[PDB]
A = this chain, B = another copy of it.
Amino acid sequence: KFDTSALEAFVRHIPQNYKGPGGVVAVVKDGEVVLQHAWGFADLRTRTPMTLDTRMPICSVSKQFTCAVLLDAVGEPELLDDALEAYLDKFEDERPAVRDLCNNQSGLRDYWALSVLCGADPEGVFLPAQAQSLLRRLKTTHFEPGSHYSYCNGNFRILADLIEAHTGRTLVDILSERIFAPAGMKRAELISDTALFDECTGYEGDTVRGFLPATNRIQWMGDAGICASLNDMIAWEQFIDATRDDESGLYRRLSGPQTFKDGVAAPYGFGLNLHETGGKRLTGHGGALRGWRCQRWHCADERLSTIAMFNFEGGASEVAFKLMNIALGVSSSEVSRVEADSAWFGSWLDDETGLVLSLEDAGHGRMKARFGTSPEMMDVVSANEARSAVTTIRRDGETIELVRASENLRLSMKRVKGEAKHDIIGRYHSDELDADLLLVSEGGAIYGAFEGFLGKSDMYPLYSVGSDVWLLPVQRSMDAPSPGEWKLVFRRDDKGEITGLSVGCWLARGVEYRRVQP
């Protein structure tokens, strides 16, 4: 009997440690459900309890299902390379291979982050014709295909379109016939229009701010769209275990090792994160949307899967990971920290990429870093070295070296200083997006708005961190996580006149804008 005593003790305390309306969790071992539990409410106002058969959007956990459809109904990604050439018909750089789309090594900038720059409302309707209009206008990459990893939902949204055109069938129908029926996922469905989903309510907020029902109206497929219950997701884990020994089986074909073009090990393959804990290899994926979070993980050597799905923005990924470590008996352990010198604090700029790192004290030998899409906590392990699980930074005087070895990324960043001039106001234009950024002063405080084919955004405050380097936080958007902070790095003439600027974030780097107004 697989002993679930420590798992049960952890699950019993989830509602107090991961505060929110409701959720579901499961642990599958050797193809058997050994732990399955629902708690709380699907809706706090109608008082509808959360159940094991309550469907929820699984969001980015859909990506692995779109690569499974690709392999099952089309074949290897190379069969769609000709069609990708016609889809990205205005491309000016070398196009990524369809295989690079599947592995998140494409170099394309994320279209949900770009939708903010095109003026999208965070709670706006987003149609299939607008997705294609934005994806098919892309011309450039932000790194050479195969050279680095970056998470790009557009890779999978394009894949869905390629699959439907090659096959002459809908992704809705192919998933149902080729994946959900054989796996025993009885109620799983691709529901592309998020405005139609009302079987469970998702909540934005947290225990301090309060919880608010989320409204989502985007339409998506390929990068997300599947809605399924805990029991549906359990059936997928059982299908995985039943087909574990078939070398030509769909999941085994999705989940092998991958590398970058230089042979360095990569962290993602065919819609799956590839990771390890205590020396044991894991494959899985998480998903997010305003109001929702979920995660699945599978350890092939121990025939073990863990699932967590919440109708709020709490740590479902952390829950699923901790259940896996508890079931594997992995002791996750303690780092000795040192005091953070005050010389670390402030912002640091990479000239090559236009990205910025900002550091602040988070107490006890810890720093809060803002660099990627979400902030990360870093342990200060020595006078000049700090690290999170993904990023290491080393300081030498006025330079920081930042490394994210899993992305094949290494940056050299210089301390940003000086007082920022307020002559940056005016209008700027991006030729590739056909979009404008308007910057105005109101009482000495600078605000900006994004104006493009999706609409005109609200005004957002900007914050300077040194001469000509400004941050523009965007906290809510059509997809989740939101982009975080856009980094604006202005460029000037030899006369000191502004000619343009770079706008970027980790999901979409170096978007060039030229000054056209003020």
Contact = CB atoms under 8 A, between A and B. Distances in A.
A38 B444 CA distance: 9
Copies in the complex: 2
B19 A461 contact: yes
A442 B49 contact: yes
A464 B473 CA distance: 36
A461 B38 CA distance: 15
A260 interface: no
Interface string A22-45: 100000000000000111110011
A49 B45 CA distance: 37
A421 interface: no
Nearest to A37: B443
Contact of A40 (B39, B210, B461, B464): B461
B21 A461 contact: yes
A50 B459 CA distance: 13
A447 B40 contact: yes
A41 B210 contact: no
Given A458-B45, A463-B16, A443 B209 contact: no
A445 B47 contact: no
A289 B21 CA distance: 25
Contacts of A12: 444
Contacts of A38: 443
A41 B442 contact: yes
A207 interface: yes
Contacts of A182: none
Contacts of A44: 458-460
Interface string A444-482: 110101000000001111011000000001011000000
Nearest to A290: B210
Q: Which of A37, A40, A41, A442 has the most CB of B within 10 A?
A: A442
A281 interface: no
B364 A443 contact: no
A363 interface: yes
Nearest to A476: B210
A102 B464 CA distance: 46
Nearest to A42: B442
A86 interface: no
A444 B205 contact: no
B207 A473 contact: yes
Contacts of A212: 212
Contacts of A208: 475
A15 interface: yes
Given A22-B442, A442-B49, A459 B207 contact: no
Contact of A39 (B41, B445, B459, B476): B445
Contacts of A22: 442-443
B443 A475 contact: no
A449 B41 CA distance: 13
Nearest to A122: B210
Contact of A443 (B47, B50, B207): B50
A227 to B, nearest CB: 21
Contacts of A39: 442-445
Contacts of A50: 442-443
Contacts of A20: 461
A466 to B, nearest CB: 13
28 contacts: A16-B463, A19-B461, A20-B461, A21-B461, A37-B443, A39-B442, A39-B443, A39-B444, A39-B445, A40-B442, A41-B442, A41-B459, A44-B459, A44-B460, A47-B449, A47-B459, A49-B443, A50-B442, A50-B443, A206-B209, A207-B475, A208-B475, A209-B209, A209-B475, A210-B476, A212-B212, A363-B363, A364-B364
The 4 A-B pairs with the shortest beta carbon distances in the complex, nearest first, are: A39-B443, A363-B363, A210-B475, A15-B445
